[PDB]
Amino acid sequence: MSKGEELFTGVVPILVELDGDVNGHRFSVSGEGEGDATYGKLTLKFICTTGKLPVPWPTLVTTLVQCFSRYPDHMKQHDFFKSAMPEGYVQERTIFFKDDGNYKTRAEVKFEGDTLVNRIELKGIDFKEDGNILGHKLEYNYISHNVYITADKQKNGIKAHFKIRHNIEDGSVQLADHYQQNTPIGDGPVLLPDNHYLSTQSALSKDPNEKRDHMVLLEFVTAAG
Numbered sequence: 001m002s003k004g005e006e007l008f009t010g011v012v013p014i015l016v017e018l019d020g021d022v023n024g025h026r027f028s029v030s031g032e033g034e035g036d037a038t039y040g041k042l043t044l045k046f047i048c049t050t051g052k053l054p055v056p057w058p059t060l061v062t063t064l065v066q067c068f069s070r071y072p073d074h075m076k077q078h079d080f081f082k083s084a085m086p087e088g089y090v091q092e093r094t095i096f097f098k099d100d101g102n103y104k105t106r107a108e109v110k111f112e113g114d115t116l117v118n119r120i121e122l123k124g125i126d127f128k129e130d131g132n133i134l135g136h137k138l139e140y141n142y143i144s145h146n147v148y149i150t151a152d153k154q155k156n157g158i159k160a161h162f163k164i165r166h167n168i169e170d171g172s173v174q175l176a177d178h179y180q181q182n183t184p185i186g187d188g189p190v191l192l193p194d195n196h197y198l199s200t201q202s203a204l205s206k207d208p209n210e211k212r213d214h215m216v217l218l219e220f221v222t223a224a225g
Helices: 073-078
Strands: 011-022 027-034 040-050 090-095 102-112 115-125 145-153 157-167 174-186 196-203 214-223
Touching: 011 040
Parallel strands: 011 115
Antiparallel strands: 011 027, 027 040, 040 214, 090 102, 090 174, 102 115, 145 157, 145 196, 157 174, 196 214
């Protein structure tokens, strides 16, 4: 039966590495944590190793491992993410921040031995020097959002579309429109997602005992519709 279903049987260790440049501002993120696909649970802590992070943490959330998503039995046949393992998959995205700049990301997610690794490249351009993102106007929070997993037969993978609302201090809201492509790293078999989706629920926090610019992240993700 199933592809790499057995790999996410228990608690998996996660390693995250991001290298990005936004409007010329270089920076690097490293994160360690663990995931429990059984419960769609993820616990991570990210550290900005290049000093102080230039953008807002919240804006990195989506970029910073859907294979940890909990799939209810009746819909396991659409688990594209777990089926690409251990080989992995490449996840690409364009994230447009309404009336602002956008992010371009390239990532590869795969197992390095028993560690699930997310290696990522990020590039930010057209950011208004005095807007929400660059002029840190975003609140340190997150909205339980949904992701519209839509197959893309041709790329042998999938395509996804969704948007994210970021709460602006003023009580308003900054929009982030995601466009994501996903192609399998191996040449192997993968499951093709019927038009489904993911109910997600994040929770960012701080570690008082942490002197470095960082973000604590707790999150549950489940597949529905």
